[PDB]
């Protein structure tokens, strides 16, 4: 059996009972028995009395999560649960799929989602092809600016070209905070690309200033991770156009959709396990009594979980709950306020849909660099 | 307003006096205008449990900070766990009073979180202080392999690093592991005399039984260990005189409530002065939305400096740790603990007091016994390092010179004696030649001893990069001598810049160039044949040589090797048998070897002078007391003549 619940949007009445009806989608070699939960809102007790009672009422053996109006502090509940009660967990989507470093050590969380390594090598893939090599490096006071800080450096050591930095920049870019500080910092800044790292509010009032102090103008172009951003269907406004982010594949799919691929993914699982040793294991679910040793049948069953591969799409989860080789794909906002595919990314090799970098100025008309030409040839 | 705090306390006796305490600073705190107020609840084994009680709290009142403590249960890493769960939710500010682990100041997985002890990674800070006091240069670093365990090492690493000291080889153990042993017997052939133990209680207990039982704890050999490896099971099988450290308040749970009590009592004013007066949610259920003033209370809290409590003043660190804690160093004299030293908040200060070091001695025991034996790495060459089978008796067949004469040879050890296919046949074998008597001439010299082993994998040495990484690996004799698992080089090893960034060579005591072998116009600026590749004629070498970065840094020559990169062989021999039965066509090297093969083996010319110029030296890690010692002998054999009497014997029997 695996358990599905949703959060956080829509009533997706139509939608949990499109996702109960196939109970038996042959998406698999045996279907395991499908079963649905909703929670009406994301909270401490909520979740846990939910998750604690399905799985105690229904002796279930994985569960699928999804996400909610992205608001963080949440995948740290579904480790310590995975931790305590033993039950392989996976993350589908939302802001619940935002890779977790440092979890528990008996945890079985499988998130997918990529960590800042991955995605800054994405990112300096496509300032090499460019050749802009500049590096404005801005980043706010948040949790994890110093994993962000290290990596940069240190995938800066990891490729061909100097990759002369200019300046890295730290500021308050909350709530509440003195704006003219900030404002009399950035309006000192010369480089014509900046890598910037923080929030979705942190990311409109950084970018709202650098519209106010003139660092927003067909001069210079931006590059954020895939934390900004937000929902990736509605771009709010003074987000710069041209504005370049790195996210994985399915990011156009449908809800339903990414829950098929969930419990693809755990019947594949078990279906793999089947052929080592014939057999499903026993669920351990209770939350109530909380016991449970190190056991190794679960651990075996969790470690044949990690690689599996189904419909031409290699999924490969490394020892922390990331999955590792995925295929990214670059995107930007286009001139009409609208995000669209810019670059693939397959194997290690970049791809772009343009061989220049479309420029565009404040009443539209693609302005052309004076000083750069085309050049024809043969063999 | 009632502003209301909660805490989490143990056994409930604790609860009383925090009441006590918390109306006594009601007291002496405040100017009648805000009142705080108390409550508290027990701890319970289920963390789920936990949790629900946690917001049943949360629920019961309007809390603006949480107090936690450790209850009797030894099981100290997730006991404080499920609080600062459903607290950091909405940003709740929480404080741990006795809890020492260095995975809750990671401040992008417990969100809110706050101690008023330093963790266990803090106590590197007085190993490097005590380590610059005692001058000790030579470090063995032996840390468990857990997060825990490789959170230390980070810091003092950071710290050598800093000053550049690159401490020497660390250890990592698989922590709950029997059987230790192997990783004392590798470190055991060091030359440090000091090592630094962290690591579980019960870890400890099996690393001192294995020191015992190696002798590891003989005289002169010093410890020194951290606070939770000296107490518990480990305290009856420790080794007699060993540094050790303890704090001062530690598990007292009494002096911390009222500091704990004292410092957020002061900071409630600073922020209810701030017009933020947004009361927390009121609902483990009603809202599902965080504190919109709860970074502000963390930020005004952090940064609260006390002014005297009972354990001192305290401020907090940019991380959340407690900061300025200051210890009391601890000795181990006959199976009873007496201090000898206090640490300060930087410096440490000694106390009236001896120490006792593991020996029994009474002057401080300096490290680094210096070595008289060391290994030696060699290869196979023609001219230079000759490799023959030993006699069936097991010595080397006794030979003479022509002029009435020995020839010396030594026994040596190396590789599986078939280099295509063999697991592990490590037969020794006997070498001889002219390298060799220049090695025998300088341990006579010098009064070192020597153990002469060959190389595993048969290259001389180059730098590539390992897949799925960017950090580049030496391979082969580099590799070897970097490792550790040699500490000199002696072979025809040539000197150039990628070598020079990691080795301290000596003077050359052989010039020498590069020339082309074929069987008997090749120029050496650029032929037609070279530069555009053939179907006939092959330009390669043999791998992971010299020549093959030289060609791989050219542009033109890079076409060369990159149409050469299909060839590429594994020794000298291999080339010289191609070469010599028209299979092979080109081969570049080295003009002393080529020039011996070529008078040696007739019908062999070579082609053109020698268009490079570079020289052979012996090679030693970096900063080694035998650099100049060897650079001078080896000078004072080239003005005696020595030199010239040993070519004349070895490199032209009169051709
Ligand atoms: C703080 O000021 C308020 C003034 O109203 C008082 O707090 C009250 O403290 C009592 C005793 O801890 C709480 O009673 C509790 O009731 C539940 C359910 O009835 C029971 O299960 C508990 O064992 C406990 O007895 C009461 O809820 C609480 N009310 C409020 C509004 O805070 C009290 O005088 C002052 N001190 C403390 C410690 O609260
Ligand atoms: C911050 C700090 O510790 N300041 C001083 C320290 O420099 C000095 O060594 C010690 C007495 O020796 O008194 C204290
Ligand atoms: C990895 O994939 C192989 C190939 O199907 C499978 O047999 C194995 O169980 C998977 N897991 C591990 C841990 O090898
Ligand atoms: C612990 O703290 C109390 C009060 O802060 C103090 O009186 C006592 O000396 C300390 N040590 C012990 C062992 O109780
Ligand atoms: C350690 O604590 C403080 C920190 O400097 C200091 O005032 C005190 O004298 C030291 N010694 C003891 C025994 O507390
Ligand atoms: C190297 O030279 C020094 C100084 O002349 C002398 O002690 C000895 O010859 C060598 N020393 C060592 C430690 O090998």
Redesign the interface.
Known sequence: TVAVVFSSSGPPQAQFRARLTPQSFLDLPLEIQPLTVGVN??????L??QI?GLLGAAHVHGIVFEDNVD?E?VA??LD?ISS?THVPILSISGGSAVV???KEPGSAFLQLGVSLEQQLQVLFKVLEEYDWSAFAVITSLH??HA?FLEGVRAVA???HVSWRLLDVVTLEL?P?GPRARTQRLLRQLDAPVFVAYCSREEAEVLFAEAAQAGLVGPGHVWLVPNLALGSTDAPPATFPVGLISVVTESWRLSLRQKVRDGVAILALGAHSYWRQHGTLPAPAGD????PGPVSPAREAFYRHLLNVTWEGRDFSFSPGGYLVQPTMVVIALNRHRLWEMVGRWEHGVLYMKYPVWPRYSASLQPVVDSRHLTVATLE | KIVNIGAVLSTRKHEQMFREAVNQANKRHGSWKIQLNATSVTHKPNAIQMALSVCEDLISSQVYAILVSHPPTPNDHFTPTPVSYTAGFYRIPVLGLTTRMSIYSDKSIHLSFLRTVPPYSHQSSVWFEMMRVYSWNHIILLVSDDHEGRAAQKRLETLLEERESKAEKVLQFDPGTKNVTALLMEAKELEARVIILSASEDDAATVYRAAAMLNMTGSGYVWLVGEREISGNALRYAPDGILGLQLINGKNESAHISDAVGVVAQAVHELLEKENITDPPRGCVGNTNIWKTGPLFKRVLMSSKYADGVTGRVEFNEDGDRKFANYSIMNLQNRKLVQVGIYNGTHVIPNDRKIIWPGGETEKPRGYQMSTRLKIVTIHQEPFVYVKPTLSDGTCKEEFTVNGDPVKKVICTGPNDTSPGSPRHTVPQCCYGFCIDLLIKLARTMNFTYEVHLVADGKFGTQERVNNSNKKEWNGMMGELLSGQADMIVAPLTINNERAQYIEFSKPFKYQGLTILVKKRITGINDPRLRNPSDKFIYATVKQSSVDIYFRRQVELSTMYRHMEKHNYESAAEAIQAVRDNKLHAFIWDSAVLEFEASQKCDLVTTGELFFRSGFGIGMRKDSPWKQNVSLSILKSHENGFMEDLDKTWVRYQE
């Open positions: 809102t994301t909270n401490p007790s909520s846990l009395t604690c608001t502090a740290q509940i310590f305590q977790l470093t440092p949790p994890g994993l050591d990891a490729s909350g509440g939350c109530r009594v909380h």
